[PDB]
């Protein structure tokens, strides 16, 4: 992978792996998820870092407020995916995270995705607005003039997301993380959620329609002690609305949305 | 990857991903039993197959595995290269083996070695055999005719007996189940899912005070998408050592067998 000429993206190129794909024989969307995380961390990794030298000192680290991904064709196994991705600031909202996937035999966009991040202090994980002092160290590596994988107006990146109500169409209990499901800090990898909402969508679903859109927000964090319900209910294409909560007293961790596309 | 110059064997080279590494910022076991999985089926694409040869097809016949033995020296670090180099013999009528070794890609020295035992079985009864001599003759072309072995030493620990695990366990890991990430492309639980649910069962302070130097594990029956586990653990001994059981939740149906060795850091 590498920084393109004027530094302000990184692109990267995947082969899809045998153990990477579904029934389909192509990239489940946990694959396709990973494979951003690890593109985002290479571009943090080329320019210096995604944590700053004075986020380190105050304690502060980059947490996803939100995740939404589009996919319009998955790579298949043995395939070769091109993904490239930039950061923008959001003034003290925030920072973003951008990707676009291409097919690299084809040059089309196959997918891209968009990540909402906010500053929050490691050890009493409350959220904080972005300084100047942090703001301006970062500035430096994103592109000043906007650059958005989802430019157009009212898009589904953006959209309000409404809580589950009870009872659930569907559900899969009893979730719990493995140390598999773990990043190298100790905490709950990002993309399990993603595993875990979808493990409540019916495979009679799984097996006709493919996953085209998931908006995924994150409330809360699953502890490595702690045990996840997973619920879905139908609202319509097919799309359903989502809910991960603690087994015991049923604290929201995420919500989310996904619409499938039939075969 | 590549086939080597005589085509009997196969090397490729793997960037530690950021996801793919533990605690240590070095490669989960997991993780390199993925890349053994990886090498071992871009093998089988490279020499014409899709391993099920034209014989096994008709019969409605697959390799599965009977024991995944795997010894690490170093972990590869994030943004490291590991090259993994492959092979298949043929053990005559009770099945084939396949090995490998694993180098750190910059000093050239060996980090790892890994050995499987492979049976014959009917897709559909579940039935085991031997192997014929018609695929024997199909798979031979693309082995060693030679010994090459990844273990050779007399009495090494990829060939030892494992015994049972007598209740109670000292450590258990009850309610163990699989997600569709933990599924191959056949809606099978992939094989590496087993070694994650025996290692759930190890405590965290050996975790984090050790390093997983050995593991063998014995394949008894497969856990279906619809079945929920309990993983098993006793300390049997510098270093230390454990035997695993991997059984069904319900009945206690044993599906896997097994023992570690870890070395303190
Ligand atoms: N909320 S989180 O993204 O799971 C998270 N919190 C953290 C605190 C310290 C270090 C890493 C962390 N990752
Ligand atoms: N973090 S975890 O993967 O949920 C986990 N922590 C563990 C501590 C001891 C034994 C098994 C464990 N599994
Ligand atoms: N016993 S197994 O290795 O989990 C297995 N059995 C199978 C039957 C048909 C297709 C793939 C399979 N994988
Ligand atoms: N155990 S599994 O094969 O990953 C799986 N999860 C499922 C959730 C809903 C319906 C069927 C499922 N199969």
Same mark, same amino acid.
């Given at each position: 992978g590498s920084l393109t000429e004027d530094g302000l993206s990184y692109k &990267?190129?995947? $082969? %899809?792996?045998?153990? &990477?794909?579904?029934?389909?024989?192509?990239?489940? $969307?946990?694959?396709?998820?990973?494979?951003?995380? &690890? $593109?985002?961390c290479n571009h943090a990794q080329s320019v210096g870092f995604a944590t700053t030298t004075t986020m380190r000192k105050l304690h502060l680290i980059w947490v996803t407020?939100?995740?939404?991904?589009?996919?319009?064709?998955?790579?298949?196994?043995?395939? !070769? !995916?091109?993904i490239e991705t930039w950061c923008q600031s959001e003034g003290r909202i925030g920072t973003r995270r951008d990707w676009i996937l291409k097919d690299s035999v084809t040059g089309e966009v196959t997918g891209r995705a968009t990540?909402?991040? %906010?500053?929050?202090? =490691? *050890?009493?994980?409350?959220? =904080?607005? %972005?300084?100047d002092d942090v703001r301006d160290e970062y500035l430096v590596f994103c592109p000043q003039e906007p650059r958005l994988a989802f430019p157009e107006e009212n898009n589904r990146s953006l959209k309000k997301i409404p809580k589950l109500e009870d009872p659930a169409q569907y559900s899969m209990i009893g979730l719990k993380p493995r140390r598999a499901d773990l990043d190298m800090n100790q905490h709950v990898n990002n993309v399990t959620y993603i595993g875990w909402v979808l493990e409540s969508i019916p495979?009679?679903? !799984?097996?006709?329609? &493919?996953?085209? !859109?998931?908006?995924?927000?994150?409330?809360?964090?699953?502890?490595? *002690? *702690?045990? $996840?319900?997973?619920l879905t209910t139908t609202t319509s294409?097919?799309?359903?609305?989502?809910?991960?909560?603690?087994?015991?007293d049923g604290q929201e961790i995420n919500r989310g949305t996904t619409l499938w596309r039939k075969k």
């Open positions: &990267e190129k995947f $082969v %899809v792996r045998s153990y &990477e794909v579904g029934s389909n024989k192509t990239a489940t $969307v946990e694959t396709i998820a990973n494979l951003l995380q &690890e $593109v985002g407020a939100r995740m939404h991904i589009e996919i319009y064709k998955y790579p298949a196994w043995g395939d !070769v !995916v091109e990540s909402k991040w %906010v500053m929050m202090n =490691q *050890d009493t994980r409350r959220l =904080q607005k %972005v300084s495979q009679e679903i !799984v097996d006709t329609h &493919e996953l085209q !859109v998931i908006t995924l927000d994150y409330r809360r964090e699953c502890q490595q *002690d *702690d045990v $996840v319900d997973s294409d097919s799309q359903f609305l989502h809910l991960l909560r603690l087994s015991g």
